[PDB]
Structure 1
């Protein structure tokens, strides 16, 4: 049928991997040809800023960072079956984008 691409994005690696594993297990149970989770390079957003609110003291800096992890899953399935598979409980913090 149609080729379905599921893009998962998260800041939490453990929850992202749990959701990906559950989706792949569901696809296997439905007996679908599923390409494994392709792992995009992790994005590291960085903000480096002075610690002090004023301009006084030793010039110390805070290095804040956020990590964004991305996964791709490919399926060959009908759209209804894909929606049913994606209808399973999704952990908070995981953003799912389905494309046909």
Structure 2
């Protein structure tokens, strides 16, 4: 029974300080792992004018938000997986449990 581990966050450093921990805890659990895949980084772009009144040279503000996503597929039961995931993550990182068929 394959369980899918989806990790996504705004922070590049925090998004893989949990995947490394999830990878390590499962290696201590001896469960076969399909390696953490780095899904494409999606950038949210918002381009607005700098001015609040429409005066002067029309200068613009490019704002970007990057999303980092990883997935780990492991052949482990629900109870064993819950042991792997039962630890404190950092703020701004959410981990999703999914069962594949």
TM-score, scaled relative to structure 2: 0.95
What are the Cα deviations for residues 11-55 of structure 1, in whole angstroms up to 9, with x where unaligned?
A: 111111110000000000010001111011000000000000001
Is residue 10 of structure 2 the alignment partner of residue 49 of structure 1?
no
Q: Gapped runs of 5+ residues in structure 1?
A: none
- Runs of 4+ deviating beyond 2 Å: none
Summarize the alignment of residues 1-100 of structure 1 with structure 2, pairs less than 5 Å apart: 2-100=1-99
Q: How many residues matched?
A: 99
SS in 1 for 2:18: helix
Partners of 1:26 and 1:54 lie apart in 2 by 55
TM-score, scaled relative to structure 1: 0.96
Over aligned residues, Cα RMSD in angstroms? 0.6
Partners of 2:67 and 2:94 lie apart in 1 by 11
Partners of 1:57 and 1:86 lie apart in 2 by 54
Q: Gapped runs of 5+ residues in structure 2?
A: none
What are the Cα deviations for residues 46-81 of structure 1, in whole angstroms up to 9, with x where unaligned?
A: 000000000101111000010001000000011011
Partners of 1:61 and 1:42 lie apart in 2 by 24
